[PDB]
Paper text:
Vacuolar/archaeal-type ATPase (V/A-ATPase) is a rotary ATPase that shares a common rotary catalytic mechanism with FoF1 ATP synthase. The thermophilic bacterium Thermus thermophilus (Tth) possesses V/A-ATPase, which functions as an ATP synthase in vivo. In the V/A-ATPase, the V1 domain (A3B3D1F1) can function as an ATP-driven rotary motor and ATP binding, ATP hydrolysis, and ADP/Pi release that occur simultaneously at three catalytic sites of A3B3, respectively. This cooperative reaction produces conformational changes in the A3B3 stator, which induces a 120° rotation of the central DF rotor.
Residue numbers in the entry:
A (entry chain A): 1 to 578
B (entry chain B), C (entry chain C): 194 to 386
D (entry chain D): 5 to 474
E (entry chain F): 2 to 472
F (entry chain G): 169 to 209
Amino acid sequence: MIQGVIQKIAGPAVIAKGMLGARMYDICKVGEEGLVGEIIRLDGDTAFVQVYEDTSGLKVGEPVVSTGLPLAVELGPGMLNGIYDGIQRPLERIREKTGIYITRGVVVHALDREKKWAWTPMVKPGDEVRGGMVLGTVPEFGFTHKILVPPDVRGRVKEVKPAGEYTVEEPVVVLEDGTELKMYHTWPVRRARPVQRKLDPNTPFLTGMRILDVLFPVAMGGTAAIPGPFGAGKSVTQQSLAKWSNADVVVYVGCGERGNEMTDVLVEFPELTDPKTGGPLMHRTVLIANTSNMPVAAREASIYVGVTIAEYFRDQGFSVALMADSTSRWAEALREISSRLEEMPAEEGYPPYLAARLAAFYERAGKVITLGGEEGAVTIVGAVSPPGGDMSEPVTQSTLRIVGAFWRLDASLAFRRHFPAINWNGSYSLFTSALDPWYRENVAEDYPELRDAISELLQREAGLQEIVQLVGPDALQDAERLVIEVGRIIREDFLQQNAYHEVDAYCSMKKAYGIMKMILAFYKEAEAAIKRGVSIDEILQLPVLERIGRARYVSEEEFPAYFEEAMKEIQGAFKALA
Amino acid sequence: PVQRKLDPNTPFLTGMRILDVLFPVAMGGTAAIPGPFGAGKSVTQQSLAKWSNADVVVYVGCGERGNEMTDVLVEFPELTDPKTGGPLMHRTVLIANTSNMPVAAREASIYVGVTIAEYFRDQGFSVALMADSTSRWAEALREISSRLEEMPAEEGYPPYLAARLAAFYERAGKVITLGGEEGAVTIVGAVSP
Amino acid sequence: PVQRKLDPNTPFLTGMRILDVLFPVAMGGTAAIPGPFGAGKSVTQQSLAKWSNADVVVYVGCGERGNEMTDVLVEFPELTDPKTGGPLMHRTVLIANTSNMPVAAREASIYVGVTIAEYFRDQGFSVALMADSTSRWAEALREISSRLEEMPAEEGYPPYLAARLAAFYERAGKVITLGGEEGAVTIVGAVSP
Amino acid sequence: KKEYTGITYISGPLLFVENAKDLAYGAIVDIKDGTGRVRGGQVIEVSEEYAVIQVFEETTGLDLATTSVSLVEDVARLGVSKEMLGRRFNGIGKPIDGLPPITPEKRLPITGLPLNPVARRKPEQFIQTGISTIDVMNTLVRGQKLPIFSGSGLPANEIAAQIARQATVRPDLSGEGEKEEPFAVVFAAMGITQRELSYFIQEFERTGALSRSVLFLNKADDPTIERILTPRMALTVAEYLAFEHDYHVLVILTDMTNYCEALREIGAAREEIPGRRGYPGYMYTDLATIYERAGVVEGKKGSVTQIPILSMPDDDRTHPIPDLTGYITEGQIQLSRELHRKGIYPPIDPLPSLSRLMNNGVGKGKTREDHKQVSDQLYSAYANGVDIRKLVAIIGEDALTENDRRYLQFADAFERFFINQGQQNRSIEESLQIAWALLSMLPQGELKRISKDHIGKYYGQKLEEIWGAP
Amino acid sequence: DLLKKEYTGITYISGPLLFVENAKDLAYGAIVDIKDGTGRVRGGQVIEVSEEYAVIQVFEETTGLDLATTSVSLVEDVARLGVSKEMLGRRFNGIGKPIDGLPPITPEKRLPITGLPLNPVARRKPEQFIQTGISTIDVMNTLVRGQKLPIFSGSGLPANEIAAQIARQATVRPDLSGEGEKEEPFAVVFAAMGITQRELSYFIQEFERTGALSRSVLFLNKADDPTIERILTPRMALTVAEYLAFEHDYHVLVILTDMTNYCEALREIGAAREEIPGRRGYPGYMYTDLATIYERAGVVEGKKGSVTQIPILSMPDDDRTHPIPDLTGYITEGQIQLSRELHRKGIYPPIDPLPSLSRLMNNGVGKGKTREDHKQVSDQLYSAYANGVDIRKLVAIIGEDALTENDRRYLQFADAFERFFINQGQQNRSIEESLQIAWALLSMLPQGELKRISKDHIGKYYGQKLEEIWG
Amino acid sequence: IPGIRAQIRFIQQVLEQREREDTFRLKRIKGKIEAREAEEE
Ligand SMILES: Nc1ncnc2c1ncn2[C@@H]1O[C@H](COP(=O)(O)OP(=O)(O)OP(=O)(O)O)[C@@H](O)[C@H]1O
Ligand SMILES: Nc1ncnc2c1ncn2[C@@H]1O[C@H](COP(=O)(O)OP(=O)(O)OP(=O)(O)O)[C@@H](O)[C@H]1O
Ligand SMILES: [Mg+2]
């Protein structure tokens, strides 16, 4: 195979000579330790290699071999309830071999080769086969893992194995041409897994958070971005999405972030429950951890590994949520490598291709009909980390032009310990109009109008706040004061939400609808009272306000009775005055 | 070349009382007008063309929009010279450039205009030069500078912008030609920030 | 070299109430006095050199006016030492590299001044070092780095400016001398943002 | 034909090829790899020692030992035909609707030539978009460039689709006129997402607008060079139709912000020092070469009109893209976030909107006689109303005089019934009727900017005429 | 291994960089000795290797180096530090050589200074509450054992005093947690990067007063010391700290005095190397480099030791948007940000709680750890202080006469907060005292405004007046 | 209003300075690569 030697070592970058014939974006083994790398430039006989591990100690003259194939992921049973590195190495196995530290050059299989899986064949001899069709099933943590033909494989089936207990290395099915199909196949990460056809997003992605799921929703096949400065709550929001989202599988990609967050997920999620199937929450989760102090070149690989795993679970008919912990660190890694390549930068050091890469990543989302004819989806929720909190960075601006929802976080709110800490004025969604039928069917026939009424009230508050700053709250009339006060009620009792509570950490759609109805009814009553001359100061003391404010913490099961009583009490609190 | 430059001791009768009285310009002077939308800049410039005491009028649109350029190229033929009642264009040279013409032409527009004005001045005449949107010309200069990879000054303009502007404007003045006659070039430029 | 460094526990008396009361400096301390032009940096430092309680003063004019050095030379010979009662110049060392003198000599002036101050400290005196403009030393570094073609940090200054300033200021301190006597160097540094 | 195999360098989007002095500058090339896959590229530099190709799409499988380059075309050309109508392409002209490829009447270089200034003429006739706030207050005149400035979450795509489906000429309002004057719409989308693509396909298919439109859709995951080429091909087709078959083409360029970002990326890929704010120093000239392919020509019955739709990067008018677009174009239709959040669609704020050509396309013999004055009165009245709305929050409704209260109610009704027309297609007559109904609320004599005869003839109509069926 | 290979043939010396041509046998990252003509030996590290030459970053000044008599020799391929438990009580310099006159230490292991990533699977979740004795940290910005909680200081702000006080007062509360009651102290590793003599004198005097120099390792790079030696100092310190913690079951507290100086050294090297900068000239890899240091703290499953970091950095112009604080905050697990406004008013420790943060706080507070009302009390304190600041801004434009009664109560709360909770001087406040003060202050507000505190907690702790504590 | 105008002018000046420094750096590096190609290819 193509063999050469090292010419030059500068950080994660290795220049290899004697590599004529090496292909672009091929995996190569640098040095005697077989460090995995990727060819990013061909120059004469030379080849530029970015090494996915550390390079300290490497000398000039050590061998460099090209595998001949690009970065690939092993897809098959054995992935859920597991944590992987950026290039899909099981970290549990690495701890078993290494100690508490991650050492370089560990060769470990992505999927367990000894575990035995029960196989129920779905095909018989003489059956036609196409890529993506289902060859059988294999139970996995309460899921029915579907064995799928590789997307570019066809033919007829020679002999299917009888139902039994085998491993992923055994040819469960073999075709006429001699192709030996196993429980797992490999796929290049940088290639979008083919699908039959895309579908218009028309169902919501429930996140459990009121503000996101009500005012700034995201569809199942949708994409969202959550930018903010450090200390605003991106990680808490994304962990809440992992815990409480209505997806089937969750892929969490820790791209260049704190290792304590991955540790937190690993330690805590086994003690929690899956919202739908009721089992442990780690059974529906995959973790890709490439922390900040790990090799920088693998930050790029983490995103592709995560998206490919998500597309695989989508091809199995599931609905998947992909949580990219930081795309900003991916961009920073690209900038580092570009500096090693001595290229012309663009904007603040970023290479010209950053936006194309980001678009290619985000366009891999969506709701599809799989090649096998099921319906699966992938929802991407990426986080951006602008320097200084500035939203005019190239990464944040590029994300703005591709995502369907923008959850802008705010430093002023987080400083006040007001969470989720979402800036309402600078946030938006594009899936609201398309999700009206679903809301009418599954929440309430007038949910769209209540949501729009709250949007109207918040915009009225935003308009009046200019005058508030100019002259102060007392200078306003009574109706404007009521607009301000209802705005505060919405901020504190509806948009505010506590993630460390045993009740308010999750909110259903009907609970949000009930709270919104309570607020709208109160606003109408109070406006009428002001029209009949009641003093505004006397409205703020109506006891019903404490019930409206405490509704958040009511349990989900108890909520309907509380809400019926609250509507009765709202009618009473003004009816008595007459 | 000219034999001598003379002092500005004679007026440039624009025909408009406000300009000719409150803020007058001398023969061989220099003026500036901003162009805001709806301000009548077009009518004022056409009136300078019609009623000024200049024998020739050179009009330069360095980087105008296509529609403004067609407006000016459709209106000027329709005007009538008050002095003779013949077409005003018989004593006018029009230099027309649109935004999509080569940047070299848009930079050279004002120089072509000022050279032609100097030629008619040397023939013993009094010529009025009206350069519309010298800001677009400055934009052409800035693009050319970027193509040369020059270090800008201020809002990306090259550090020699003022030098070029002075070179263009100081070519105005009342003079005694090499033929011994008297002629002048009066420049009215427009700035559109 | 020195035997050991000590904790500043004696005031550096400047004769100016605001500095001596609200913002004191110890005898081996460091002070910076930035200000725009016309604020009183030079007058403040001259007053420090005239009335302070240092045995020796080393005044260093880097990239500043020559009239100031001329003023010092003309005036101090007819002024009295605060403590010893003799002429003021007899306790002053003047290092002058004015604005229009060679630029790279500013660095040498700073280093020469600090070294002479250290010498007199090693003789057991209390020495005040007045740097008239450290900004001009930074400018000299910037020019020399431009001739080296080094990649610049903020505002074109070389990325080691902070290190050089730190090394210069860290020569201040009250110390036990190699001969066992007690000495101090107090550096007041003017900055011209 | 002739294959070049001296590939000496591959890095990012560039590959160097030696002994290629026969490749013209800007020629389109094909790249075959070891697996036989064919990529595409463009010659970006030709020298006596090597040529530089810019590769569309990625450069994954390429190797220096099994890569060959062949010439496709010396000049990027587009095969245009009248059969293009009813078809959707991909930004380099390839069909993406599944239909057979067209047989061209001719092939034209996408980089058209500048129009001769002395061949132009004054725009003097209007296009009826069906939207009241544009038709009445910021009219559109054939040959104009009237961009839409929008924001991040605003519905610019929906407005684009609505104008695409509703835009028509009105030959009957211009004297007797000609009943048959062909009209076409060219819709150029740059860097759109899959959901937006599906939306556009559905919108064009449902109402039958496809039959009179040509679509050039470039996705955000498509190559950037295709994004740069898309507007040029759109305008090539538009010029062909207008100036060879007397069509009245309306061109919509969906996202010029995407085009500008792609332009900056391409410039940085060729080692160009960027200009102001990091954008190319020639962005002005490039935008001009796009925007100035519209107008009306002497002796030709056709015209080209442009509606470039750009998203204000951070709701900032001082940004390069909108500032330069303002230099080149004539006015702007400004979308307001306050109206959008208040629930008003289409959220066009008349106050910062301006149509620079409205005068020449409005008046007698084109529309109605009362159009200019009605627009002026609407503008002034709405401004007064917004002012009173701000003041009443501090002084109170009682403190206001009676005329001020009239202005308040007028502004509310204007927002509710004029701006907020939903998806309805309003003819100019219906819009003017609504305008007069809104103006009837103010007393006669406060209509200081409308002639007496117009007020007499059209004043008094109650709001019940349109309130019954809003 | 046992032989000395010497590389004459140096072709370049400029600033911090040295080029040596035929050095094809030098490993990337190796450590070398540079011997000049006079015999002085200077260090350096290989940061680029090729068949042409090797780039060496020098750790000292280049005065006296010539291209004829200068030579380069190898010390080791990977930079390792000799590590022994007997390093406690010793003072080392930036490159880890003794400066106290005692003999060089006999290593038990030679560990690489860069270290290795800690496996996320191996990590343990930090949950032990550390009582610092400072109310703003203890109640509202709780510090746990195994956390990276830096201090964001200014030019003249007293961050060093706060660090000394935290080291002096730190302790766990075994009684409140239910675990074994042990009184083992902290082992303090102290890394000074470009420290002035004034600050170093203060720190040394304070530690000597407290008798902590016996259980402390000091790595001192002063202001007169070479600038490029600062790249190694934090890594040496963290190597020692990790060794002690995860091989000898120590609870290590690491103080990194000035990370701004470290970042400046990084910028010097990167500028010499023509690295594409990020913002304000700092290298594009500064985030990764800072994470290689900060992320070396935590706790590991199945071991009793820990590492806790308290980095101190000075915000250049009190700018939180500057790259150094920005990246640090993106990496660390919170920050304690000082305020110059409170400093001018005389408040010590001048800690502004609104910009401060502690990520891991929720893991070390609550029932069974400190007390049940802790979290809600901190949330309510933030709410009330934010209201007070807003009302101050309102008064700045409208005047006190227009303030309603509730607004005046909030202003009075803000002033009392600043004067009695934030301002404590040098006093060790138990978490119970701090909670008591917080409660006495919250009692200045009507019962109903405490929306973040549960009704039962309000019943159990509301009402006590501030006079019962003082006066 | 004048104070906010002064603040705006200051911020705009700082941003222009940062842009100028970036352009200077880009010119340096482009010249570096060009000189590399011209001299040592
Ligand atoms: N001297 C004048 N006498 C009468 N009417 C005038 C006079 N000057 C201007 N006007 C009127 O005012 C209008 C001025 O606005 P208009 O839009 O026409 O200006 P413009 O000169 O074309 O502007 P710009 O050059 O900035 O594009 C003229 O069209 C005409 O209606
Ligand atoms: N303490 C003072 N008493 C009286 N006049 C003073 C005092 N300080 C400054 N001045 C006046 O201010 C003038 C300028 O002061 P000075 O020369 O010290 O400025 P500077 O801050 O050093 O500025 P520059 O950078 O221009 O040299 C002095 O000539 C004197 O007129
Ligand atoms: Mg001075």
